[PDB]
C-alpha cells in the first residue's frame, strides 16, 4: 500500500548512503 | 509543606551529615592515594586533551574544603535513601 | 538418489531391533562411528598431538609413572595411513550392513 512516490524517495536517500561510503572508503584506503 | 516535601528534606540531611562528619576523612584519603594514569603517566601529558584532571572548578571556603562535586556525590546518596523510604511501602 | 535409493532402501536396516538381522542395525551405525572417527586422523596434524602428549607426561611424571618407552605421536605418514584405514573401513562396512539388511529382509 506504500505510495509509489515514497519508494523512490527512499531509494534516492539510500543513493546518498552509497556516495558517503565511496567517499569514506577512498579516504580510509587512501589513508 | 508536608511529609512528601518534608521527608526528602529530612532524609538528605542524613548523608551530607556523614560525608562532612567523618567520611570527608576517608574519601579525601583515598583520592590522594588513587589517581588515574596510563603507561605510567596521567592522561593529560599522554596527549589526551579532554582528560586534564580538573580542580579549577573544585574549591570552597568551606571549613574543611567540602566542594560542589562532593555535594553531588553525597546528595545523590541522600536521594537514594530518600526514594527508598517513601517509594517502597514494603513490609513497613 | 537420496529419496528413491538411500532414503527408501535404508528403511529395512533401521527398523530392525529385536529381529534376526538386528546385528546389521548395530554395524550400520558402527560403520558410521569408525568412518567419522577417521576424519580425526586425516584433518589433524602431528605437531598438535605431540605437543599435547607433552602435557600428559607432566601428569605421569608428577605421579612418577612415566614409562621408559617414550610416547611419541604417530608419524606423518603413519597418521595418514590410519586415516585411510578407517575412512575406507568404516565406509565399506556401511554398504555391507546396508545391503544385507536390505535384501535379507526383501530378497
Amino acid at each position: 500500500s506504500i505510495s509509489e512516490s515514497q519508494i523512490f524517495i527512499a531509494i534516492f536517500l539510500a543513493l546518498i548512503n552509497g556516495f558517503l561510503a565511496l567517499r569514506l572508503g577512498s579516504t580510509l584506503y587512501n589513508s | 509543606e508536608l511529609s512528601p516535601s518534608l521527608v526528602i528534606s529530612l532524609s538528605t540531611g542524613l548523608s551530607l551529615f556523614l560525608g562532612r562528619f567523618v567520611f570527608f576523612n576517608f574519601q579525601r584519603e583515598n583520592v590522594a592515594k588513587q589517581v588515574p594514569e596510563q603507561n605510567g603517566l596521567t592522561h593529560f601529558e599522554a596527549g589526551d586533551t579532554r582528560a586534564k584532571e580538573y580542580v579549577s572548578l573544585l574549591k570552597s571556603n568551606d571549613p574543611v574544603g567540602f566542594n560542589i562535586v562532593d555535594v553531588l556525590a553525597w546528595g545523590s546518596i541522600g536521594h537514594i535513601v530518600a526514594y527508598y523510604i517513601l517509594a517502597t511501602t514494603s513490609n513497613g | 538418489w537420496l529419496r528413491d535409493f538411500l532414503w527408501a532402501q535404508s528403511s529395512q536396516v533401521i527398523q530392525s531391533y529385536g529381529s534376526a538381522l538386528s546385528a546389521y542395525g548395530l554395524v550400520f551405525l558402527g560403520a558410521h562411528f569408525v568412518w567419522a572417527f577417521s576424519l580425526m586422523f586425516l584433518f589433524s596434524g602431528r605437531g598438535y598431538w605431540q605437543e599435547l602428549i607433552e602435557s600428559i607426561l607432566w601428569a605421569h611424571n608428577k605421579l612418577k609413572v612415566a614409562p621408559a618407552i617414550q610416547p611419541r605421536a604417530l608419524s606423518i605418514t603413519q597418521g595418514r595411513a590410519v586415516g585411510v584405514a578407517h575412512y575406507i573401513f568404516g565406509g565399506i562396512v556401511t554398504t555391507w550392513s546396508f545391503f544385507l539388511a536390505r535384501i535379507i529382509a526383501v530378497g
Binding site: - | T49, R50, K52, Y54, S56, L57, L58, K59, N61, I68 | -
Partner: protein, 183 residues
C-alpha cells in the same frame, strides 16, 4: 569575575574572546584551534534565536499567531504557498547566504557578515555594545528553552504563562503545574 565564586580558572582562556565569566565546567575550551569555531556558533545561536523569541513574543503578545507551535499547521498564512514547495524555497535562498557568510567567515575576516564583506552599515560599536551581543545572546538562547517547557507541560504560550503566574503565583509555577497535569 569568575562564574561561581573563585576557582573557575581556565589557563587556555584569557577572556579576550568576546565576554567571559570564566565558565567552562566540562573543558570543551581546550585545544583552542577549534575554540574559534565554538566561539561564533554561540554568536550565531544567540544572534539567531534572539529573534525567534521576539518572533514568537510579538505576534503572540500583540497580533496573530497565538499558539506558535501549531503555526504552520494552522490555516491562512500571509502567503499560501504549499508545504511541499515552501521547504525548497526556504533552503535555497538560505543556501546562498549561509554558504556566503561562511566563505566570508572562512575568509580572512573572522567576524560575522552577510552579502560578502559589508557588515555594519551604521558603524555603531565594536566594544561595549559588542559585549551586549553575547550577554543578550546567552540569555536569549536560555530564554528559548523555556518556551519549549511552556508548550510541553503547560501547553500554553508564554503570554498566558506570564499572565498565569502573576494571577496565581502559588498554584502556577514550575513545580506546581508539572506535578499537576490537567492542562
Amino acid at each position: 569575575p569568575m562564574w561561581l565564586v573563585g576557582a573557575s580558572a581556565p589557563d587556555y582562556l584569557d577572556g579576550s574572546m568576546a565576554g567571559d565569566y570564566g565558565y567552562d565546567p566540562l573543558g570543551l575550551g581546550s585545544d583552542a584551534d577549534r575554540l574559534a569555531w565554538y566561539r561564533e556558533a554561540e554568536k550565531v545561536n544567540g544572534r539567531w534565536a534572539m529573534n525567534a523569541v521576539a518572533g514568537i513574543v510579538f505576534c503572540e503578545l500583540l497580533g496573530i499567531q497565538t499558539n506558535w507551535w501549531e503555526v504552520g499547521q494552522n490555516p491562512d498564512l500571509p502567503v499560501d504557498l504549499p508545504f511541499n514547495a515552501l521547504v525548497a524555497i526556504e533552503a535555497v535562498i538560505m543556501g546562498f547566504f549561509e554558504v556566503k557568510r561562511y566563505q566570508g567567515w572562512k575568509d580572512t575576516g573572522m567576524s560575522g557578515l552577510n552579502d560578502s564583506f559589508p557588515w555594519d552599515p551604521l558603524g555603531m560599536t565594536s566594544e561595549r555594545v559588542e559585549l551586549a551581543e553575547i550577554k543578550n545572546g546567552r540569555l536569549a538562547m536560555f530564554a528559548w528553552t523555556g518556551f519549549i517547557a511552556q508548550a510541553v507541560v503547560v501547553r500554553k504560550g508564554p503570554v498566558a504563562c506570564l499572565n498565569a503566574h502573576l494571577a496565581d503565583p502559588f498554584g502556577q509555577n514550575i513545580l506546581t503545574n508539572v506535578l499537576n497535569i490537567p492542562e
